[PDB]
Symmetry: D2
Subunit: 372 residues, 4 copies
């Protein structure tokens, strides 16, 4: 498997696994990493929905950042300054729960710029992305204020770009040769969208969540990589959640995209490569889902799980697994020492600072060796 | 290792690892599980701070619920309706980041009662837990409002019990023979606290985060199990965070509790068993932290990592690892049907319902087979 | 998932994963665990072929014990004295490589009876199981003779029960109402067999390795659980091994059982449950293998991987995953202390015993403390 | 942690983990990977003893190849033809049990040259390495003869270089500017040795197994990397194996090298870096073993577990963890395939070949697609 090894002390070429941080990205290349593929029910094997897109022109994007996904993002060895642009398909916790963790961790770990967040509006102000992030920053005000005591607050801001969720395939970002368009999803209530990323002859579609709709098959047509929700079977709903049959059947027809519907949809789209996600990917669930899909779609398919990676180039769309460090660490970026705002008042009161314990004797031994 | 097997077809007794869901809790026993032991930097091997406490009277509490920790809590096979009470030591993201995932996950998992959260005030209103949780719920208003259309909203409520952070070892909870007391910490800014849980002659101490203070040594004294922050060494601050020598030194003295400070503290406390946490627990980090602690403390010690478990009985405090499913699922509890509230408006507009794709043909096959 | 929980302090019933050592085996129940499902190419995800069968009457058997598999066998928390009976399908390293690990490990771990091995003859004496194990014992004579100085040697014996590979579904083992039968396979050269285990109205078939043959579909018929070789695709041979097309084609026709052949076979057998094994079970291999089977077989199917388990009862054959300790330990059983032999010459010469370094000083401190 | 990233599309330099196959080895550099660190008791966390050594001149050696270690060796993406030279410290199953898996899997992984094995004599012919390997090859006669019909059998050979176990520090290998020296161990019976590898001004010492001896501290002096056995504490012997105190005490004096003896030895040796191995490296064992080493030795130390890696340079010896694929595959080398000799007997009878099942129909469909 992998490229032929030509040499005893050299590097193995075209490796059968993707080791994050080991492979340069070609100027006509895209890398997409599934940093979460699961559900609002949490699990070590699957973080909630998250995707990292890396373009050969050096731009990077996170599309969705659900609960748990930061552990996988952080295993990528990408500096925090290269991941400042996040697109949200919808405001479910399994699609933006870890925004706070990228916000606070990336700032404790030297992001110098503010985060930038694109997400949809709702039917009214309290149902949209601008309200959502504004209240998230208030929810975390203690964190924000205490950390801004010692770190310039500028990376602590979130610049929100809200767009009309009703818009049919309209441009929502246009920068440095890169476009995103959105269209609507049919999912729990008005607001949710899917995205298409256009750059340099490629199209990458992030379906978010939806029941099957008329918009996706139209605006996703001919994508290099087409991502779409694909649900657990009605039999699995009966077995895993003890649903009675009526309600089990309806989940796969009214509320979600069935495996058989996902097949219908990607048959219409004819992408280079289709990606099914948002099911629990276990030894007793996956096979009936892949069969549901094969009933109607025959093209190349990935059955997504965490740390699956796609390399998009002119000749091929290639699926591999990323082999990344469980014991992850922050990895430094180029950026320069950004200064705290020393007008910032302390958030301690003297009542608390009065309780400091004297540990001089306990610490003298290691201090003296370390200062030596 | 473990209890001796007595029969071919029987159960292996006193198993050398804890398999969650497989062991009865006796009436004079406590089980504590580390569901997060790490940092604001995410990694698959260590979720951020979270502790599950189970008492032999049937009460269960969560103390802290940091980013990523829900994946570990969910692997315990405890119905979400048994984990409704949550204690927060402070409002850093690595201590309450997964409250949202508990709130949303727990409600798709059929929690039927509101969450109940105890945490500290701050030095003004927008720095305490009541303000934080109230704005967390607004931040997720789309999630809340769309979910309540389909699921009775009573479980989607959060009753916050905000207590005075300034109070010195006061009761913040007292029910069914169980007491929680709080005292302050010194950490980033006013608000953070440590807890002591008292029940049936046991005392369990959850230190949260702090620089060394005069209160913990006094109010944790004699604990069966005492947990306290234990920082990565100043050499590791240089190696890993390429810090200059000066700021590397000050981290372990001013901002955080060094391993040597932790040993001094636990030497003052004389617990049956001390627990060091909140450091990256790796092959090249753990041993110098251990050595620092042993400079000043000789008693029983656990170097925390995720899914470590302590069983506290009259005769012993035992450390084990928990071996739990990575492919976790919600497990059902005994509660029942909440009679959904009819008085909730749909959050769809006709404009979005009009987009539904006809998928009758694609689904007819599985659909007619299933309806057997 | 799993049984409904009834009690805060109780055990979760009918758990959705199998924790080895945690479940009582009923009198009319069988448990089968895949302790290896892989190839002669090694890999942490998949040990080479091995199966553990546990019967409700207390009897346990290993069928195949390939390289790597003892790590999975050891995770089951089953005392060494309960696993003294081993059946080999054939004499490839990936089917008996860890026999020597069981022999040596289970003797240093208080096995007190000799191992018992059943395996096939070959066309001549040096091509059968008796010859193979006789020479395995000679290969490890240093390990044998040195161990026998300090441990009673009786359990270091291996009693081989060689049976006629040519026989057509004839008994090779009969004891305590348990029968094994053998029939031939077509695999590299004369010798390899498949087994059926009969007990208490159950039939479990262990296919071993073969190209498709007329015997398996006839003699496996109606099995409760039927295991058979199922090969990676001819396309996968070109991608993964760089086979030129024509050789890749013959591999799934002449030498191995194709996924499509596997499905024909199981269509003829009509087992209550089929098991495909002995392919690399990866995110980019498994789905086309499963499609292959489903071209011709529609019944219950497991795509085996390591630590998969089947529970066989009158009502159901259930597939689960086993969640087992990675940091495994031997667990003691109810045997009795066996007496060493003093008619045993030391394997040391004075030349070596004279090399001992005095270490009394370095060991003084711990030594004094331990003796109180 | 690790080196500073300088571009979005480029390669993370001096990575904090070692990804096998991702890094150039320099002309004055050595890489050592622990491919097994455990015991005769099997465990997924720890294969039995094995070491891979990659020299900057491009030579590679395996020192010990214990049960289970080939899963770790195969994760290094090194062509089988580069790993033909194997040194054994002694003939316990946990130091050479996976030789048969290197012999058989390596040969089908592509090795074209014989294996070459160096190991000690014993006190008589039947206690030596030559006898051991000649009888291992007879044990796998069925595998060898059946495989050799389909191949040139040249790679199936194993040439043994047996050397006297009694020799003090004498050359047993001297080739291409690499030297190995052996000297004796005190372990179970006459015969075990330790090795030193010298190349290009560096020295690496593989202790194997021993009770403490006068030869290791003399001939290992000044090593860049010194590896020695270091046993679990006597309290751990009582807790984990239920040894009575007296027997537990002696295990760490008479039979094995205690943690404290290990520290004295490494104190005497003064290596650039010491490695302790051959203990169960668990959350509840490793801290008491480390402390034992630290009573007597305070130089750089590694507490081995599996897939620990050392890079040796002039200016440093860096410990890292390797992050390698669990779903490993063979990787092809330059070595080109050879001409057989149309002259070996088939091992099939027509009795067996007449049992082939006609699967033409079930396979015709995929067969057609493939023949494009
Ligand atoms: Zn959603
Ligand atoms: Zn979702
Ligand atoms: Zn904090
Ligand atoms: Zn914290
Ligand atoms: Zn075979
Ligand atoms: Zn095989
Ligand atoms: Zn040994
Ligand atoms: Zn050994």
């Amino acid at each position: 498997a992998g490229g032929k090894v030509t040499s005893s002390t050299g590097i193995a070429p075209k490796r059968y696994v993707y080791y994050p941080g080991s492979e340069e990205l070609g100027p006509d290349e895209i890398r997409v990493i599934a940093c979460g593929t699961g559900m609002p029910t949490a699990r070590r094997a699957q973080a909630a929905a998250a995707w990292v897109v890396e373009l050969g022109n050096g731009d990077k994007f996170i599309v969705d950042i659900g609960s748990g996904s930061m552990a996988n993002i952080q295993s990528l060895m990408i500096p925090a300054n290269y991941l400042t642009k996040i697109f949200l398909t919808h405001l479910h916790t399994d699609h933006w729960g870890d925004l706070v963790s990228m916000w606070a961790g990336g700032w404790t770990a030297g992001r110098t710029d503010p985060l930038e967040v694109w997400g949809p509006s709702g039917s009214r102000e309290d149902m949209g992305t601008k309200y959502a992030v504004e209240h998230m920053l208030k929810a975390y005000n203690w964190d924000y204020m205490t950390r801004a005591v010692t770190i310039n607050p500028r990376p602590g801001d979130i610049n929100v770009h809200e767009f009309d969720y009703r818009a049919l395939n309209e441009v929502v970002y246009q920068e440095n040769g890169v476009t995103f368009r959105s269209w609507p999803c049919i999912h729990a209530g008005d607001g949710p969208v899917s995205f298409a990323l256009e750059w340099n002859g490629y199209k990458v579609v992030f379906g978010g969540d939806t029941a099957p709709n008329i918009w996706y098959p139209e605006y996703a047509k001919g994508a290099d990589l087409a991502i779409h929700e694909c649900w657990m079977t009605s039999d699995q709903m009966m077995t895993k959640y003890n649903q009675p049959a009526q309600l089990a059947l309806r989940i796969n027809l009214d509320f979600h995209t069935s495996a058989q519907s996902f097949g219908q949809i990607m048959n219409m789209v004819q992408p280079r490569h289709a990606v099914a996600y948002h099911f629990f990917n276990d030894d007793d669930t996956r096979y009936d889902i892949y069969t549901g899909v094969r009933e109607n779609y025959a093209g190349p398919l990935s059955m997504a799980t965490d740390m699956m990676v796609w390399n998009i180039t002119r000749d091929a769309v290639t699926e591999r697994m990323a082999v990344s460090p469980d014991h992850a660490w922050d990895v430094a970026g180029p950026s320069e020492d950004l200064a705290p705002d020393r007008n910032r008042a302390s958030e301690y009161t003297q009542y608390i600072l009065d309780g400091r314990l004297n540990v001089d004797e306990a610490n003298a031994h290691w201090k003296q060796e370390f200062m030596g």
